[PDB]
Ligand binder design. Structure first.
Ligand SMILES: [Mg+2]
Ligand SMILES: [Mg+2]
Ligand SMILES: [Mg+2]
Ligand SMILES: [Mg+2]
Ligand SMILES: [Mg+2]
Lengths: 212, 196, 195, 204, 222, 233, 125, 222, 4, 196, 195, 4, 4, 4
């Protein structure tokens, strides 16, 4: 799996692949690795499919109970720390989860938290998580600026997953794009790597390693 | 260890060797492996000395409390209590026990309880490491409704062979006779049984 | 040993090789050249098990130098790579195999073409426009997939390589103390002193 | 550390009406890392075609070994080796390394120049011959290829039809395997012409 | 795999199934497990497919050279001795389980060889994963003084038991009949009771379905 | 986590037109030692069910006690205990199947393979298998241990599918079972000559047969067997 | 454990133990809270029947729960300590999990929740 | 040491149409190389137009189906006989599976039925309860053989419009119940040929708004 | 068991 | 397996069961474990079928070559060749062999060769898994200078018990009689020996 | 986590803590603060097992902050260190012990003295003029043995610390992406922004 | 390997 | 692994 | 560890 989330002038970009594997068997190419917790909160999934899917769905229930009890949308910090405190209780039991909690609130602004199953919780501007994280980092880091336009940032996020989808055997299927603004998350479509690769290769003139 | 119990006309006889071993060292050469759980219910102990003593002590306790409330327990009842302990704690016990008793209704009865904790009612039973060597001999020689002198000879000759071939068996041959007459202890020394 | 990169451009092959030699919790040296010249127009970078790397490199160097003297002729990069692969392919079923991974950058004077060969310790040979060994590939391959063009100049190739070293210095856990860069072209082998 | 599934790759061969087809993917990787998208697994010695899946160092070594042996064969026999004979040579050569084998899944394909009969065969790493009328499969997606071939295949397909069937068999099997794909090549083999086609497939 | 040997009054018959497996996958639905060591000595093999084939061919080759050297038709006991000495030498690492049968100047013979180099004599034998299914049928129906037609029926019935009840065995029944004073008759696919039913649909694709990047003529000529 | 000590071997069974047959030998093995020769491994529950048990005998004797206790409990406050509310084979099986799977799930299994053979109140034949893993399956023929490998092939030649059951008589079915027991005696090293056989018929009811012996054995051909190849004497 | 239901309903629909607790509050020294435009002020009475007191060490009537919230009270002094301690612990627990100090409403809602629990828990007044 | 898991083999297959859904499974039950039953169904009507199969370890499979059937019963009791929607069933099964996260159910689960818009639905689960709605899913021993065929024939993967230069894909369209049953029957006959744990019989459960219909077809018994 |  | 050789007045008799096992499956139920290494030197094979056949074939080769050069070998010579193979290859062999032969000078002789490769000359010998159960019976019943009929009964009764108790032993009881008269093969079927 | 240093000088305690957070072959973050303020004049740096480090730090922070509110009084550095040691000393014989190593730098306002405490995950406490955790000590201890004087100023202490970081950047195998430096004195805790 |  |  |  390859998931990235990075922060820029125009908000947060979240991009994920859609591949699920059982060793070298490709189980699915149509997996939703982004959970929409609420209109201003996104969760990314990497590692154990069941572990991520169950606990990030559960996190959504805890975030709903918070806004019922406190009459106020939960902070990204508090939401991330519910999940990090949960997995820390299971530490050593063998949960496998690599997760980014991405969202906007008034008090915080655009915020990204990395949370994994050994209990690590980090705030940061750029994260790539999954088997293909290094491939995504390579393209993302070498092209990343704070002053990217919403159009350019969306493309760089999409191009960084495509990069990993290509090289990493355990990443691919399609790219799912999200843009998080002060007004909440906006879905920017499902992009099949089948068509996207050839479209990018032709238009960009990249991927010269491949027989055109 | 070599232990056996044989039913006959007048009741039942229990026989055993007298040797306890750690490795190839004989820790005790005059062991009493024939132990009383009730006036006319006795058992032969094989396997772990610690485990068999702990089990026998508990069974004696249960049958003493049984006797206080419901009078003399059957040999079947005694075997059932042994089984219950052996079966329910099979993971933590190494105890092969032969239960032998004399009722006045049921006469002589023998129950064998192997490692599993299963119960088997038999005309006679053999157990312990030395038993392997006398399956052939005991099967060919055992008859039902033997006399006391015949049964004593059968046990003496049987354990004599078991002791001869098994390094883990040796010393004296102890026997316990259970009849209407009462309880009789018998002992046979090497100088007698070796040259049978 | 750890980081060895290779980029074939229009008219040359560029090999970048990390300078760090680490043993335990001590960086013993920060100026190590992880390369041998096999012939005037063929360069081999190497990475793997301590001792094995240099022993294997110098053994290959000696054999290619012997061939050069005997025939008064320089073996093609394709020929040298095929020889090196077969030595490793023998090695892997030996009592103690060479645990050495190599890049072979050469300029074929007959074809007037640069050639880059990536060979692992099993004897797995591939001709590539760009290659890497160890964990370096996990960053550099996706980066080069994007930025690499086949008609680039040596100067463009060096800028593309700077982009790789910057990415590795940012995201690699270990300090590899920069790289020694060498260019293989029609005029032979020369070292870039300021990188 | 399973030699047969480090580099990855697949080969499939099929028979048609007076023709044979052999196809392979182009991926060479180091487990998760894709390294090369140009690594062909099908070679030919005269009119006899050999596809080899498994450990890539042994794929290369065996190709070089069979080129060597078929070259000496031709010099001594004064004729090109036939598929049936080459099959026996592959089997001998693999079983020679019985207790130190090449980690490979070879597949022979070709038309006997004398009889004109289409011929395909497969082997285990130890040299056991698997002869078939219909199709042979090999590699990391052999399960997938068995499923595709057993459903899609029908006897006596024309060269142009057989091309579609083998291509769809390889493509759909490769897309369900992580270590296979990254491009594909299909050889259509008739009595005295051979067409080689590179397939367009998803590059993930 | 299921292989059997059955003796009758004037000879011996061996039968086998035709399934080859790689783990749970059927590699070959119609493979030949019946091997000719010599014209009138035939071998049925179970275990590692290459090992049974290689050991059969090697002894078959050495038996032919021995036959030419001695100017005599080869004997089953010779094939048996050479096989068991070879298999013993490799301490079971050559995984060949064989039923060796044939007719020679001495008469008709039926033996089994295990990978470790033990040999057994019998009137009926079975080896392989389906040996217990086959041996059940043989133990139920075998009698002394079988005819040719009875021994073929018994042998094929014992293989069928393996085909149906054993997952290791399947497809067809190969038989070889070695009768004294006659040529051995090899009955390839004697029974074919597992024919694939007509498919519901033709999956013949419309021409041009597959996307192509490049075409080129390959040069096979000099 | 157990290891079985005293063990019983194959239990074999099949359906016929009117009911079911089940059989099992009377041996309690102690590894390679054939220790106990008077062991009954067929345990009738009422007049319409027989439970055949293989595996550990201590665990078998425990299951005997559970079934004995089930009959007692069923009779409690039950005027129709010997009529409409009598124990069915399907009830007895589902109880054992529940226990077996609960014990495997607590990593402390009853080390047994169990076949429940009987006839339901509506005259339907009941035959179903359960083992230490709690795995259950039904088939016209069922067998445990070596029986699965050697008995089933012979019994399936009589009843290969469902449609063959009405065509199979009790004479034909019993003959097949007795033949299978002989084959198991030839080939199973932990089997005995002495066995028990039970027929549950929807007309004649439960017929329990004790002290049966394998007979009509072929051994004569052994005299002709000399050496392992070359030996003539 | 002591289980007795001490706080129960009376025929007229009153819980006398809760109403008698209010009498203890009415007995307690006066406490006043006045919130201005940009401040809150907590005023507290201290009965003057106690001279020879040590005002350095005597528990102060206003208690800090966190650096930004204070709690004054009227009623049983010993009871107040238990509420203050619980509130102070919940204040630190909130900072630890929400990464933000409590609101005054939240801290109040907690203290109120504790007081309520003791009106329908067995064995407690 | 005691191993609490076993493999009972077999394979299952779910396909979703426009106004219907099918859940097919072979009726063979095995352990190792032995056949336990030739007809042991593992595709169950659970009520509320939901069909379910839990293929793998039959004991864990039966346990799960039993618990879900029981879950449906209590949903009726607790929510005024409300119909359990296929999406709601799927989420309930996730919680059943993930409940045993640290001692898993060794089974692959597929449910089929109609969504609340009356359109065909298939949901598939991993052993610990990760789930996903799909048009298409094979599960069990022969999943790796059948799934790529379904990709090609149901979702028309790698199929391009003839003469469009591999630029226009073959358009997605719903299949008729007649066409879907052809693919199921061909999928299973193909799987039976090449997988030793698949055969004996095929049982299909078809779900329309009218209820749950069954169809049975013979498979090869070797 | 799937992984992502 | 259950094998034994017994010396008597006229020579020596070899007895064996007929069962070969892989696990609890009986691979061969009519095995011939009595094998000829010379006209009047035979052996009983126990342990690995493959190992014992390989050893017996080599010994037969050595004694055939011995006979060509130095005439008929002694039973002691045959036992010495068996020992040499068993001892020098002890690390790679599982073979318990009883060597029995008839000279005209030495009459009947029995040598037993256990796993170690040690040689033991005895009046009679028992070996194999089933032998454990008949040590007691054989010791009590064996006499020196028995008649042919007495020795045949002794072996038949002995192996009968071994077969009864040992799962690894069964089938027919084969015997081979070695006297001045020549070589006689005997077979006894279950229906006879089971009900002894 | 990896590098945490501490130097007690005349009038202050200086804590240096590496900024790198590495998992696998990826440096996820290069700006991580491996410290919590326990009280206005007490700072604790931490290094060890992922998750455990922050969970343990924040747990201690919460307990010291609770004590401060309850008593309206700041616990002495000696008192805080004794509390932290006892928590770790309990931990080590738990089902799953905290694998966290800590330095506690504090200024005792009553004594007017800086104090540095080194505590490992076993609950081994020592007061030191200079301390380190992990492999850092193997370089810094011998360096400080030489260059350290007890009467040094904060500026001298920072130069002595620069000498340690330079030595670690030269000889340590891993890139730890520099250090965050914090000073604890009579005026409380402040961070040096340019290091 | 392929088995038979 | 035939035994006797 | 005494046995009998
Ligand atoms: Mg990929
Ligand atoms: Mg692929
Ligand atoms: Mg099949
Ligand atoms: Mg026996
Ligand atoms: Mg310390």
């Amino acid at each position: 799996t390859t998931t990235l989330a990075f922060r820029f002038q125009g908000g947060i970009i979240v991009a994920v692949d859609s591949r699920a594997t059982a060793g070298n068997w490709v189980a699915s190419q149509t997996v939703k690795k982004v959970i929409e917790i609420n209109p201003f909160l996104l969760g990314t999934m990497a590692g154990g499919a069941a572990d991520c899917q169950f606990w990030e769905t559960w996190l959504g229930s805890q975030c709903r109970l918070h806004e019922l009890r406190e009459k106020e949308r939960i902070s990204v910090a508090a939401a991330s720390k519910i999940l990090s405190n949960l997995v820390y209780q299971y530490k050593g039991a063998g949960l496998s989860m690599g997760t980014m909690i991405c969202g906007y609130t008034r008090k915080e602004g655009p915020t990204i938290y990395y949370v994994d199953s050994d209990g690590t919780r980090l705030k940061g501007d750029i994260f790539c998580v999954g088997s293909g994280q290094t491939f995504a980092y390579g393209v993302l880091d070498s092209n990343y600026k704070w002053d990217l336009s919403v159009e350019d940032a969306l493309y760089l996020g999409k191009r960084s997953i495509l990069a990993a989808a290509h090289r990493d055997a355990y990443s691919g299927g399609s790219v799912n794009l999200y843009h998080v603004t002060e007004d909440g998350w906006i879905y920017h479509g499902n992009h099949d790597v089948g068509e996207l690769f050839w479209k990018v290769k032709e238009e960009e003139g990249s991927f010269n390693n491949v027989i055109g | 260890t070599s232990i056996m119990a044989v039913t006959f006309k007048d009741g039942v006889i229990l026989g055993a060797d007298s040797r306890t071993t750690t490795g190839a060292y004989i820790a005790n050469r005059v062991t009493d492996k024939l132990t009383r759980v009730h006036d006319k219910i006795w058992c032969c102990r094989s396997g772990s000395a610690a485990d068999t003593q702990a089990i026998a002590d508990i069974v004696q306790y249960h049958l003493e409390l049984y006797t206080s409330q419901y009078g003399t327990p059957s040999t079947e009842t005694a075997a059932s209590v042994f089984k219950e302990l052996c079966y329910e704690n099979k993971d933590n016990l190494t105890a092969g026990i032969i239960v032998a008793g004399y009722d006045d209704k049921n006469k002589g009865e023998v129950y064998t309880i192997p490692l599993g904790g299963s119960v088997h009612k038999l005309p006679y039973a053999i157990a312990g490491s030395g038993s392997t060597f006398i399956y052939g001999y005991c099967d060919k020689n055992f008859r039902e409704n033997m006399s006391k002198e015949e049964t004593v000879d059968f046990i003496k000759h049987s354990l004599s062979q078991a002791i001869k071939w098994d390094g883990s068996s040796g010393g004296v041959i102890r026997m316990v006779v259970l009849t209407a007459a009462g309880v009789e202890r018998l002992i046979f020394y090497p100088d007698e049984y070796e040259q049978l | 040993m750890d980081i060895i990169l290779g980029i074939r451009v229009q008219d040359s092959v560029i090999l970048a090789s990390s300078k760090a030699v680490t043993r335990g919790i001590s960086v013993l040296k920060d100026s190590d050249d992880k390369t041998r010249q096999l012939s005037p127009h063929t360069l081999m970078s190497f990475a793997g098990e301590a001792g094995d790397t240099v022993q294997f490199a110098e053994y290959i160097q000696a054999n290619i130098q012997l061939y050069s003297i005997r025939e008064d002729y320089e073996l093609s990069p394709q020929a040298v790579s095929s020889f090196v692969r077969q030595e490793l392919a023998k090695s892997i079923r030996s009592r103690r195999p060479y645990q050495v991974n190599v890049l072979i950058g050469g300029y074929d004077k007959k074809k007037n073409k640069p050639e880059l060969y990536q060979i692992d310790y099993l004897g797995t040979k591939v001709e590539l426009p760009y290659g890497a060994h160890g964990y370096s590939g996990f960053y550099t391959f996706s980066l080069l997939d994007h930025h690499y063009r086949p008609d680039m100049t040596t100067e463009e190739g060096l800028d593309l390589l700077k982009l790789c070293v910057q990415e590795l210095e940012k995201r690699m856990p270990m300090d590899f103390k920069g790289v020694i860069v060498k260019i293989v072209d029609k005029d032979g082998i020369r070292q870039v002193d300021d990188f | 550390s399973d030699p047969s599934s480090i580099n990855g790759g697949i080969v499939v061969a099929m028979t048609g009406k007076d023709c044979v087809a052999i196809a392979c993917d182009l991926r060479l990787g180091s487990q998760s890392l894709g390294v090369s998208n140009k690594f062909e697994k099908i070679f030919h010695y005269g009119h006899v075609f050999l596809g080899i899946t498994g450990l890539a160092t042994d794929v290369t070594t065996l190709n070089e070994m069979f080129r060597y042996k078929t070259n000496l064969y031709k010099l001594k026999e004064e004729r090109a080796i036939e598929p049936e004979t080459f099959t026996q040579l592959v089997s001998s050569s693999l079983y020679e390394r019985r207790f130190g084998p090449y980690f490979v899944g070879p597949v022979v394909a070709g038309i006997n120049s004398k009889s004109g009969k289409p011929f395909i065969a497969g082997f285990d790493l130890i040299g056991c011959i698997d002869e078939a009328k219909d199709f042979i499969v090999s590699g990391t997606a052999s399960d997938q290829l068995f499923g595709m071939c057993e459903s899609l295949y029908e006897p006596n397909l024309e060269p142009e039809d057989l091309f579609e069937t083998i291509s769809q068999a390889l493509l759909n099997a490769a897309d369900r395997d992580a270590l296979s794909g990254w491009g594909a090549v299909v050889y259509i083999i008739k009595k005295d012409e051979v067409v080689k086609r590179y397939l367009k497939m998803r590059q993930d | 795999t299921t292989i059997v040997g059955v003796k009758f009054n004037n000879g011996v018959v061996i039968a086998a199934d035709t399934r080859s497996t790689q783990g749970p996958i059927v590699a070959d639905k119609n493979c030949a497990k019946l091997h000719r060591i010599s014209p009138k000595i035939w071998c049925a093999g179970a275990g590692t497919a290459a090992d049974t084939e290689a050991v059969t061919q090697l002894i078959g080759s050495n038996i032919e050279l021995h036959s030419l050297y001695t100017s005599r038709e080869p004997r089953v006991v010779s094939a048996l001795q050479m096989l068991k000495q070879h298999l013993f030498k490799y301490q079971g690492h050559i995984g060949a389980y064989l039923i060796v049968a044939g007719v020679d100047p001495t008469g008709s013979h039926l033996f089994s060889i295990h990978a470790h180099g033990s040999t057994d004599v019998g009137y009926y034998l079975s080896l392989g994963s389906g040996s217990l299914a086959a041996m059940a049928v043989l133990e139920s129906h075998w009698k002394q003084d079988l005819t040719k037609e009875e021994a073929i029926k018994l042998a094929s019935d014992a293989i069928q038991a393996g085909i149906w009840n054993d997952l290791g065995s399947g497809s067809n029944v190969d038989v070889c009949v070695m009768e004294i004073g006659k040529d051995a008759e090899y009955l390839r696919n004697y029974l074919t009771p597992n024919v694939r039913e007509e498919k519901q649909k033709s999956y013949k694709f419309p021409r041009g379905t597959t996307a192509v990047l490049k075409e080129s003529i390959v040069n096979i000529c000099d | 986590t157990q290891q079985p000590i005293v063990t019983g071997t194959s239990v074999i069974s099949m359906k016929y037109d009117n009911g079911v047959i089940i059989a099992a030998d009377n041996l309690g093995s102690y590894g390679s030692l054939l220790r106990f020769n008077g062991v009954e491994r067929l345990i009738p529950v009422g007049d319409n069910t027989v439970v055949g048990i293989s595996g550990d005998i201590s665990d078998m004797q425990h299951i005997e006690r559970l079934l004995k206790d089930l009959v007692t409990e069923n009779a409690y406050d039950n005027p129709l205990a010997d009529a409409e509310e009598a124990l069915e084979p399907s009830y007895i099986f589902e109880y054992l199947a529940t226990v077996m799977y609960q014990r495997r799930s607590k990593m402390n299994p009853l080390w047994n393979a169990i076949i429940v053979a009987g006839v339901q109140s509506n005259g339907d034949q009941f035959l179903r298998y359960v083992n230490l893993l709690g795995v259950t399956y039904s088939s016209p023929t069922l067998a445990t241990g070596f029986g699965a490998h050697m008995a089933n092939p012979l019994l399936r030649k009589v009843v290969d599918r469902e449609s063959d059951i009405p065509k199979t008589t009790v004479q034909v079915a019993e003959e097949a079972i007795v033949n299978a027991m002989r084959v198991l005696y030839y080939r199973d090293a932990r089997s005995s000559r002495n066995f028990s056989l039970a027929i549950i018929d929807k007309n004649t009811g439960l017929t329990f047969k004790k002290n049966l012996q394998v007979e009509n054995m072929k051994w004569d051909f052994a005299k002709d067997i000399k050496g392992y190849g070359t030996q003539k004497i | 454990g002591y289980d007795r239901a001490l706080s129960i309903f009376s025929p007229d629909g009153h819980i006398f133990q809760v109403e008698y607790a209010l009498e203890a509050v009415k007995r307690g020294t006066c406490a006043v809270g006045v919130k201005g435009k940009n401040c809150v002020v907590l005023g507290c009475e201290r009965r003057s029947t106690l001279k020879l007191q040590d005002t350095r060490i005597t528990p102060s009537k206003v208690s800090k729960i966190d650096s930004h919230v204070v709690l004054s009270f009227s009623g049983l002094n010993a009871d107040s300590r238990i509420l203050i301690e619980k509130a102070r612990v919940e204040a630190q627990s909130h900072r630890l999990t929400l990464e933000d100090p409590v609101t005054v409403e939240y801290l109040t809602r907690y203290v109120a929740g504790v007081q309520q629990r003791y009106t329908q828990s067995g064995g407690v007044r | 040491q005691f191993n609490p898991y076993g493999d009972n083999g077999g394979t299952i297959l779910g396909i979703a149409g426009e106004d219907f859904a099918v859940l097919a499974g072979d009726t063979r039950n095995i352990t190792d190389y032995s056949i336990n039953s030739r007809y042991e169904p593992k595709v169950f009507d659970c009520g509320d137009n939901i069909v379910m199969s839990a293929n793998g370890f039959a004991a864990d499979g039966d346990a799960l189906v039993k618990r879900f059937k029981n879950s449906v019963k209590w949903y009726h009791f607790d929510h005024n006989d409300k119909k359990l929607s296929i999406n709601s069933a799927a989420r309930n099964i996730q919680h059943l599976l993930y409940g045993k996260r640290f001692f898993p159910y060794y089974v692959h689960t597929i449910i089929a039925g109609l969504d609340e818009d009356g359109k065909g639905a298939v949901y598939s689960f991993d052993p610990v309860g990760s789930y996903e709605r799909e048009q298409c899913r094979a599960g069990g021993a022969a999943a790796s053989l059948i799934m790529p065929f379904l990709d090609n024939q149901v979702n028309f993967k790698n199929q391009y419009e003839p003469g469009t230069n591999g630029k226009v894909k073959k358009p997605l369209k719903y299949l008729s119940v007649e066409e879907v049953i052809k693919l199921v029957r061909d999928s299973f006959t193909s799987a039976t040929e090449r997988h030793i744990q698949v055969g004996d019989g095929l049982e299909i459960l078809i779900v329309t708004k009218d209820g749950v219909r069954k169809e049975f077809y013979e498979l090869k018994r070797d | 068991f799937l992984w992502x």
